[PDB]
Amino acid sequence: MIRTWIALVPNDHRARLIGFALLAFCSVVARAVGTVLLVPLMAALFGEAPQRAWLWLGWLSAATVAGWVLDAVTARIGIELGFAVLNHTQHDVADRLPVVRLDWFTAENTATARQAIAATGPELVGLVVNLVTPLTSAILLPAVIALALLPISWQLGVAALAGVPLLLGALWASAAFARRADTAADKANTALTERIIEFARTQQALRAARRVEPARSLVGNALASQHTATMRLLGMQIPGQLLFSIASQLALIVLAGTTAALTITGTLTVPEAIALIVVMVRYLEPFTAVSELAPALESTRATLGRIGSVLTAPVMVAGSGTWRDGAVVPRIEFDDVAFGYDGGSGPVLDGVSFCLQPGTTTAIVGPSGCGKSTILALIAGLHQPTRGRVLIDGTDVATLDARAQQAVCSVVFQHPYLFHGTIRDNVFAADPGASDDQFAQAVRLARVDELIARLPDGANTIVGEAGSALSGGERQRVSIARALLKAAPVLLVDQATSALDAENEAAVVDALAADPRSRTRVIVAHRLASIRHADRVLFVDDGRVVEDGSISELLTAGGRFSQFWRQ
Amino acid sequence: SWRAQAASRLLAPLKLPLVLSGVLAALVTLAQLAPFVLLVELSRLLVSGAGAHRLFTVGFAAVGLLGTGALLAAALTLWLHVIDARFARALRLRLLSKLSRLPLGWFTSRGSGSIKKLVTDDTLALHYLVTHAVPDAVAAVVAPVGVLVYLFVVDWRVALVLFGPVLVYLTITSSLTIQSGPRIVQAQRWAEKMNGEAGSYLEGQPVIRVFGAASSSFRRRLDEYIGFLVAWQRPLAGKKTLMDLATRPATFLWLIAATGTLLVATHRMDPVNLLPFMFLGTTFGARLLGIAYGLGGLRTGLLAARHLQVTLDETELAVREHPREPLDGEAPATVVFDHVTFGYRPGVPVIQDVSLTLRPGTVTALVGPSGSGKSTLATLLARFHDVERGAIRVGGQDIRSLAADELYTRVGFVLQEAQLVHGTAAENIALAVPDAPAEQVQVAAREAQIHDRVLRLPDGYDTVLGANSGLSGGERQRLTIARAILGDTPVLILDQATAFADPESEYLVQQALNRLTRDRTVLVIAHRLHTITRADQIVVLDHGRIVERGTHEELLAAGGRYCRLWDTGQ
Ligand SMILES: Nc1ncnc2c1ncn2[C@@H]1O[C@H](COP(=O)(O)OP(=O)(O)OP(=O)(O)O)[C@@H](O)[C@H]1O
Ligand SMILES: Nc1ncnc2c1ncn2[C@@H]1O[C@H](COP(=O)(O)OP(=O)(O)OP(=O)(O)O)[C@@H](O)[C@H]1O
Ligand SMILES: [Mg+2]
Ligand SMILES: [Mg+2]
Ligand SMILES: [Mg+2]
């Protein structure tokens, strides 16, 4: 909340941030002076001549007007610091996410990011006023009231100074008693929302496995644990309230004892002690004002912790090189590459080396789980190798600017994921400033023109959340059309035919291999009639390239490729 | 909107613990108002004398009453937060027990970010409305009305000035419930719109890193959300501050001190009658401000309660709709479609009049072009969509009369998109039967040719997989073929299941599925026409209607639509 929230505000606002902590100190000083000026006023309003309480009402009015003005100004400068922290952090997170390492997004580092970019709303524009302004005001008020009570008599000054350590200790112990139950409730809430999202996403499997009724759901257990965590939090929060009440009571007792003693001995008159009672009521109010702000304090602590954990994620490595006018139909090449996944078994690849010629189709066949969609991800640049080098057109791909290395590849993923929207929106997501000539070309090559002419509102049909409003083949053809509408001179096609039927796949293969634009195409395939064109096959097995060559000579020498399809 | 309909039928079981928390919150605020009617009797008692035996027992009865009123006020706001944490659960446990039987068309229209919101952030938006809404509205009526009645009988002149701040407060609080009432519903359309973007921005991350311009629709629906928060909270926090400066106890303490020094300096008043004001005219501000700051929450809890009741009234998949009888013509485990007609949108149809029937121990194929109603046929056999014309009778009884807990113990399903839950590698194979002891999960994995691979994870059959954090796509469906081998069902519907499998590891999975299902009923949707050469009956299905059925040796040797879907690929 401090030294944490201060890290979020930018530097251009570090000229009106140190001028906001002054108008708050002057605000609480005006409030304290206006509260204290009641004791000389009521002491002359009870005396022989009450007409000498006019010169003590001008000062009270001055203090009150100054308090009004200062509070309005700090409530106007407050929201201007929320609208400048929310904007800054949201844009920073949105810009940071596409650069974080792909192995950072675990099951628990994804809920954190989703909450950071989805939950942080009116509670980032409204902590600069709501949380911190009343909190610091209430913290400062007793001490300033005591320093202002010092001129009347020093005994009350030192009797009211003794009250603020009590409030500080009560705050500390209240926040330290509930702290574990609070973080447990936070974890339980996060797990519940993650289970709810999973239950809403993979619903057909859960239904077909009859795991949807809360008696046996995977989300029913999360809800039960969330309820127990919140009940434990409610139970653990009350010691803080009892301790705040005790602090209030004993500070009031100290103040009242000092006031009674000073009245009896002969220092204060009776008209003065009555005003001191009102002064001490105003003194005690902050004690009951902080008890409400403590829980919100812990909540914003958790929120800022999430935002900071997202903003301090390990970004992918990137140099400073660029291209020579993009590439120019480049030559991909592996240089003793070796890559193992973060959480898993040993290395997928280990010392794989080959050189792809420029402007040639190349197939990559092999058993299941033998390191193919990881070779494509290493070529694309979605994964940095853990040893060796990937050289596109000669220039190591990891010594290129982050925006100049995601523009040399257009990938067709194995599991197509379209975004929520229409079909043309997804197709134009690759190249938004495209004409209709290249759009029609892309959509015709991928056999999506007939899909559009076969749908009621084609080219505008909603495509569900991922592709849920489309069949498994239509979603894949939309993905192919999207990947063909990009000027990247490398076409990494993944399986990209698993769902298409026999006469759609032949058309798609012929059209994709009869592209006007010259590219360096790489095809991963499990079907034999899906390559049919590649002039070089790479039979990767277990991570090694067992053997390579042209299709016209791999099936004449008895090897893995010859008998990989006979049975 | 201030309507309570559909928000009074929902939160109806809290009928009584709201009338009892209204007489226990207008009785607690009379106990937090007692110390200040004693500080007033002690203040007018000091001025006169009253030897210390009388000042002891009005000073000690006002420092004990403070503690007592602060203690039996946290005992009520704790009993209220308990019967609300207990009701939010009893309500959001009725939600995910109601929408566990809605048609899947209700899920593929909201998404996953508008369903998570409905359950989590909509049962949490009723907090204020439940716990601290009646206490705050029953204290802000009995404290001010009564602390302003007692003060008009001691001196009407000074108590007539204290209406100055009350009149300024009533205008600033009435030009607020008016000004921000479209922006309480306009802000619920942004929450469920940012949840969807957050969902589709973390899951489709490999796509945003290649194409880049796909994050445009998220970075442009974010400068608008920020621009909506900015001009919603900017004019609201100013009126929430002008409403506190007028209701603050430092404003009444100045007004009183300024109008009482006018009536005592001119000898009109006596300074001993100001004492009832200094301690009492500053209390009701907190109550007024508390009820005023809590109208946004009170109005959001009526939108949440209206969205939660329009959902708990939906039309679900009833389990008695229309059975003919459980017998007379069809053996167990034989499925029968007859004149089935379905369409996802009301106007457009997807399947049109398919007949078709699966025999007890034979294999059917269901081939055809892409996007031509095959996964839809399997889906509405799984009773996800409740067909619109014609019946479906698995075993002789309409599936609209099976308990959906006896239906899924007859039919098994291997879906076309292999989705697996966030658990270990053995909580994803034993999902239908969670208690396959340990050596039935291993046999299922052995039959689906994935045992050797699963025994290679960091810690074997106990590795937490989750959403694609292991198990490459070609072998995260062989883990869903094992999930359907374990928990054997008399009729198994295999979708495109060997799509991601090489033709050396699909010949073993489809060979350890010919030995298991020698007496089961199979329907194996396929696009590789060479795997299903030996099926008992192949049925082509294009544009939602059967056009050809036979044994593939009659199909390729008599007619077309298959002799030109098989010749394109040989
Ligand atoms: N996200 C991941 N985290 C950890 N390990 C993974 C991940 N994805 C794949 N693996 C492992 O890395 C190995 C290489 O997987 P890869 O994706 O290359 O398989 P594949 O060749 O695409 O399989 P298929 O051809 O059947 O789709 C696999 O054995 C798999 O178990
Ligand atoms: N949730 C949905 N909402 C609206 N329309 C849908 C939905 N799911 C599918 N459709 C439409 O219904 C039609 C039938 O699609 P279906 O999923 O049956 O294809 P399929 O024949 O199984 O395809 P493939 O064999 O290539 O996977 C498709 O054209 C699709 O656009
Ligand atoms: Mg793959
Ligand atoms: Mg609360
Ligand atoms: Mg399908």
Residue numbers in the entry:
A (entry chain B): 1 to 567
B (entry chain A): 276 to 845
Task: Quote the study on this structure.
The heterodimeric complex IrtAB has been identified as being responsible for the import of the two iron-loaded siderophores (Fe3+-MBT and Fe3+-cMBT) from the periplasmic space into the cytoplasm of Mtb and other mycobacteria. This protein complex is vital for the replication and viability of Mtb in macrophages, which reside in the lung alveoli. Like other ABC transporters, IrtAB contains two transmembrane domains (TMDs) and two nucleotide-binding domains (NBDs), with a single TMD and a single NBD in each of IrtA and IrtB. Interestingly, although IrtAB functions as an ABC importer, it adopts the canonical fold of type IV ABC exporters, which are normally responsible for the efflux of intracellular substrates such as the multidrug resistance protein, Sav1866.
To trap IrtAB in its ATP-bound state, the catalytic glutamate residues (Glu771 in IrtA and Glu495 in IrtB) were replaced by glutamine (IrtAB (E-Q)). By contrast, the SID-truncated IrtAB (E-Q) (IrtABΔSID (E-Q)) incubated with 10 mmol/L ATP-Mg2+ was suitable for cryo-EM and could be resolved at 3.1 Å resolution. Addition of ATP-Mg2+ resulted in an overall conformation that is substantially different from that of the ATP-free form. At the cytoplasmic side, the two NBDs of IrtA and IrtB form a “head-to-tail” dimer, characteristic of ABC transporters. Two ATP molecules are bound at the dimer interface, each of which is stabilized by an interaction between a Walker A motif in one NBD (IrtA or IrtB) and an ABC signature motif in the other NBD (IrtB or IrtA). Two magnesium ions are also observed, which ligand between the β- and γ-phosphates of ATP, a serine in the Walker A motif and the Q-loop glutamine, near the ABC signature motif. The TMHs of IrtAB do not split into two wings when ATP binds. As a result, the TMHs pack closely together to form an occluded amphipathic cavity with an approximate volume of ~4,600 Å3 (~2,700 Å3 in IrtA and ~1,900 Å3 in IrtB), which spans the entire thickness of the membrane and extends to the intracellular part of IrtAB. The marked difference between these two structures in the occluded state is that an additional unknown metal ion is observed in the cavity of IrtAB. However, the precise identity of the metal ion needs to be identified with more studies. This metal is bound to IrtA only and is liganded to three histidine residues (His356, His402, and His407), which are highly conserved across mycobacteria.
